[PDB]
Amino acid sequence: XXXXXXXXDWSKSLLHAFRYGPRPFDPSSQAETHRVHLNVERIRVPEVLFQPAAIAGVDQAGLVEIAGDILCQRLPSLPGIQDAPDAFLRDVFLTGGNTLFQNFDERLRQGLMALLPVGAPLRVRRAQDAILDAWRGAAGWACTEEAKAAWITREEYLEKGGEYIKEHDLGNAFA
Amino acid sequence: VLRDNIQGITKPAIRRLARRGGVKRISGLIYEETRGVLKVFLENVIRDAVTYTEHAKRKTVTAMDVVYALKRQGRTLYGFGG
Amino acid sequence: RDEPWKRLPPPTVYPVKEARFEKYIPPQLDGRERALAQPPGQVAIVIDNGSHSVRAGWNFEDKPRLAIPPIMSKYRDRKMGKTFSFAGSDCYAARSHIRNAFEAGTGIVSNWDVMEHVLDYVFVKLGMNEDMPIVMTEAVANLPYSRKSMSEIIFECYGAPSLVYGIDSLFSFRHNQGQTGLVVSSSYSATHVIPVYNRKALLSQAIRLNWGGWHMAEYMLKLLKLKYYTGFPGKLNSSQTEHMVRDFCYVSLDYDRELAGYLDWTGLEDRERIVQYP
Amino acid sequence: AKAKTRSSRAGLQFPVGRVHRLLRKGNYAERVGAGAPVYLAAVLEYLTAEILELAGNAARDNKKTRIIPRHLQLAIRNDEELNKLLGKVTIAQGGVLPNIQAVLLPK
Amino acid sequence: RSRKESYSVYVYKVLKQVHPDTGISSKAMGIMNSFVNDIFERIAGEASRLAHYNKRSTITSREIQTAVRLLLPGELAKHAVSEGTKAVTKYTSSK
Amino acid sequence: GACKRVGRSDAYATEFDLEAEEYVPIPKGEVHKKKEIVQDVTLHDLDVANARPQGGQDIISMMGQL
Amino acid sequence: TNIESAPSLAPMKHYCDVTGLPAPYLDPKTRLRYHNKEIFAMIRNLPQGMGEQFLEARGAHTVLK
Ligand SMILES: Nc1ncnc2c1ncn2[C@@H]1O[C@H](COP(=O)(O)OP(=O)(O)OP(=O)(O)O)[C@@H](O)[C@H]1O
């Protein structure tokens, strides 16, 4: 090869690019061994919400597929409501703390656009203060007439028992 | 992960071992060979020792693991238990 | 060939943001003085029982006063001869005997000896020297035994006029001034999808996905444990992986095209995000 | 109730129940797990196969369609791992490996 | 008549599986039988000592696996653990 | 009323692992594309298409001789 | 109550579990999805006790009992 080259490593393998990056290898220095490089983990870890059964093996359905199952297969088959696509698609918004990722609403919008019929006025947005509006909603709810008609006083706990449920439209089902 | 350490078994140490073994004159190629043999030996022992440690679901290799390894390898060692 | 790393720029590196303590002990007593000045029926203490961060405050404000994890820790020192027990954010994550009120992976409270001390820290740092109504959050389709035990701790331990349970995502719906929609809320413990029809939750058909931010942190910890394979000289906590996920992860738009050409050499220097250690 | 063997359920040939009985009445432990007989039977059957395979090869080499002790010996003494496994084992009527030193060879 | 058990039919079945067109002599049969017996005593013995070392009174599949890792050398042990795990998994599934 | 099977969609691609179809992606456009085309026909093509069956269902022409 | 979690029935795109790249074929010895021959080399010479941890991270480890 030297005679051919005279007559005429790590940069080939992807595992060095996967662990360490395009820079050369670690010479076992002080501030070089103690480094963690992130390439695929940026887009592999927040992808489990949409493809759970393949990336992490949780045997459930994706977020897009759950939203499509509810919008297209259960809500038109439920009696007592008027419009299943014309009402529930007016405001689909995103609440929780595990939501403030870059380009999260757009992925759900493209998935629902792939599932829903053409012409549905889909408008996906998000809340204003996603980690703090869960407190502010119960703050604004706390001293109204429906809340006053849904409290459990001390003598009601002494009489009705422990598992007593004032059936409010936000709480769980009564038992 | 440190560097080498096979050279930790220095020349005068191997010479000492040969002296206790009753060797008058030692060749130059004896030392590397001895390092190899000791490496193979320690590998064979530590493998089984770590195996015993793993079966006990422990993260610390005890002396009794070494004793069991040596005993099942055919070199019983007194003065540590068993 | 020296070209692919000769003109390559020096790296821009980010340190580790581990969830440490913070130097604050306020005994805030300026809230009770404002709470006793309002007319009755319009004063209540609201506690968001979050799995990652229990929040608590008074209803007539906009920001919550206390925002702590459910971490507690108790000790006994024989070199001093004294029993310690502090909770909340006052734990440093040097000693750790940490056990959490929530079960790991599910937002159902089943560690009541921790939840009692967490509520104790809440009522101390709000200021209770003596009886206000309590509005408190829970998880969707909560188990009855947990609600029974929580109500027993509220009435019997502390003594309260009234409390009422609600779903926090639906409260954030009602604050966001919606009427009928499809609330999708990805929490720290599970991701709920709840259809709401005219300010009423249709909880007979809501579906929770069993994935969350804690699962993000644990799966990120597993992949950094298996990526750096030969042994990484560093303490790989779960919380520092959570802070990696918080600021270094984004959902890609078109995944199968972005993924297959991601580890190409041309341009990996701008995709890669690098983390030091001390 | 249509009984089936434990060897069939484990997809093995070696008797699982027999191995289980021998472990129980062999003074090895007070109790024995349910995975122990199937695992042990699997290992024994695997080793059996590995020897019989090479033995069949050595038998084919000598133009014989019946494996004799000589073929077993040739199979074990060539496989270094199998040889280490049976280092202190003498195979009857197996002879030795044809091996002549280079010094004894004609000049 | 006092029947004496043996591993003859089993090693015969294995023989038919790996080499359908080869035979086996009575001497080699007895040799294979003694072989299987010896390894059985070895693995079971080492498993027993393993159980006794950790103050346990039950030999599970874990003790057997560790014993095989200690006795069989290298790739032989690897394939052995492989076949064992496959068998115990398939047995676990098919009740 | 003309129909062509383009392929199997790539969402159902890895159902099995060595199926033999042409896996193509879902089209990222409309489903109902409406376009207009001006197009010519010569009268000799009318003559040929009215005399003998042409192209579509003329399967006995693969013999060739007569 | 608490039995409203629902599974799926759809073709899953199987990715690699050593790296994150899309991987089209697995192994008989260790059952690992893998991208190319470098990852196959690192799979077939990895130290023991980790080839089960990859299936632990993906799930369905099925550890012994
Ligand atoms: N800027 C951010 N970017 C991305 N993620 C964030 C950001 N800030 C917080 N998070 C995530 O939000 C999560 C906290 O969510 P939150 O505490 O609101 O859930 P929760 O209401 O406690 O859940 P539950 O209602 O089940 O108790 C953390 O996992 C964190 O990763």
Could you tell me which of C103, C76, C101, C104 has the C-alpha nearest to residue C87?
Answer: C101
CA distance B33 to B14: 11
β-strands C191-196, C207-209 pairing: antiparallel
Residue A158 main-chain phi, psi, to 5 deg: -75, -30
**Which protein residue's CA is at the shortest distance from atom 12 of ligand 1?**
A97
Q: Is C243 in the pocket of ligand 1 (CB under 6 A)?
A: no
What residue type is A153 in one-letter code?
A: T
Tokens 């249509």 belong to D2
Give the dihedral of Cα atoms C122, C123, C126, C131; nearest 10 deg: 140
What residue type is A5 in one-letter code?
A: X
Reading the block at residue E5, the tokens are: 């058990």
Cβ separation of A118 and F31 shorter than 8 Å? yes
Give kind and range of the element (H or E) at residue A152: strand A152-153
Q: How many Å lie between the centroid of ligand 1 and the Cα of residue C50?
A: 9
Cβ separation of F13 and G13 shorter than 8 Å? yes
Contact between chain B and chain F (3 or more Cβ pairs less than 8 Å apart):
no
Q: How many CB atoms lie within 10 A of CB A53?
A: 22
CA distance E66 to A149: 66
Could you tell me which of G60, B36, E95, F37 has the C-alpha nearest to residue D38?
Answer: E95
Experimental method: cryo-EM
Q: How many CB atoms lie within 10 A of CB G63?
A: 9
CA distance C230 to C274: 19
- Does residue A67 contact residue C193 with C-beta atoms inside 8 Å? yes
Range of the domain at B71: 1-80
CA distance C262 to G15: 14
CA distance E58 to E61: 10
Task: Report which DSSP code applies to A89.
Answer: T
Could you tell me which of A152, A129, A138 has the C-alpha nearest to residue C44?
Answer: A138
What's the CATH number where B34 sits? 1.10.20.10
- Does residue C87 contact residue C157 with C-beta atoms inside 8 Å? no
CA distance C235 to F42: 82
**Closest residue in E to D49 (Cα–Cα):** E14
- CB contacts, 8 Å: A60 with chain G: 5-8
What residue type is G25 in one-letter code?
A: Y
Which residues, 6 or more positions from C238, have their beta carbon under 8 angstroms from its beta carbon?
C217, C218, C221
Reading the block at residue C167, the tokens are: 């779903």
CA distance C73 to A35: 32
Sheet with C66-68, strands from edge to edge, namely: A152-153, C162-167, C134-138, C45-48, C54-58, C66-68
- Does residue C27 contact residue C125 with C-beta atoms inside 8 Å? yes
- Does residue C209 contact residue C218 with C-beta atoms inside 8 Å? no
Q: For chain D, give the number of residues.
A: 107
Domains and CATH numbers, chain E: 1-95 (1.10.20.10)
Per the annotation, does C204 bind a ligand?
A: no
β-strands C162-167, E58-59 pairing: unpaired
For residue G15, the number of C-alpha atoms closer than 13 Å in the C-beta half-sphere is 24
Q: Which of D4, D20, D48 to mutate to test the interface with E (most CBs of E within 10 A)?
A: D48
Task: Report which DSSP code applies to C84.
Answer: E
**CA-based radius of gyration for chain C:** 23
- CA angle centred on B26, ends B22 and B29, rounded to 5°: 135
Residue C253, CA distances (Å) to A93, C256, C258, C267, G4 in order: 18, 9, 8, 19, 29
Could you tell me which of E63, E74, E62, E10 has the C-alpha nearest to residue E37?
Answer: E10
Domain count, chain B: 1
Domain boundaries, chain D: 1-107
Cβ separation of D9 and E94 shorter than 8 Å? yes
- Which of G7, G21, G59 minimises the CB distance to A56? G59
Cβ separation of F15 and G11 shorter than 8 Å? yes
Tokens 């303490």 belong to C235
**Which protein residue's CA is at the shortest distance from atom 5 of ligand 1?**
C246
Reading the block at residue A103, the tokens are: 């380009």
Give kind and range of the element (H or E) at residue C208: strand C207-209
State the sign of the Cα–Cα–Cα–Cα dihedral C3, C6, C9, C15: positive
Resolution (A): 4.3
**Which protein residue's CA is at the shortest distance from atom 17 of ligand 1?**
C52
CA distance C109 to D16: 46
Reading the block at residue C29, the tokens are: 């007593």
DSSP one-letter string for F1-22: -------EEGGGTTSSSS--S-
- Does residue D59 contact residue E22 with C-beta atoms inside 8 Å? yes
Which residues, 6 or more positions from E68, have their beta carbon under 8 angstroms from its beta carbon?
D43, E43, E77, E80, E81, E84
Q: Is C103 helix (H, G, I), strand (E, B) or coil?
A: coil
Q: Is D56 helix (H, G, I), strand (E, B) or coil?
A: helix
Could you tell me which of D48, G36, C44, F2 has the C-alpha nearest to residue A143?
Answer: C44
3-state secondary structure E20-68: CCCEECHHHHHHHHHHHHHHHHHHHHHHHHHHHHCCCCEECHHHHHHHH
Which residues, 6 or more positions from B81, have their beta carbon under 8 angstroms from its beta carbon?
B63, B64, B67
Give the dihedral of Cα atoms A45, A92, A150, C108; nearest 10 deg: -10
CA distance C263 to A14: 7
- CB contacts, 8 Å: G29 with chain E: 82
The separation between CA C261 and the C-alpha centre of its own chain, rounded to angstroms, equals 35
Task: Report which DSSP code applies to B75.
Answer: -
Reading the block at residue C254, the tokens are: 């078109």
What residue type is C162 in one-letter code?
A: S
Reading the block at residue E83, the tokens are: 């076949």
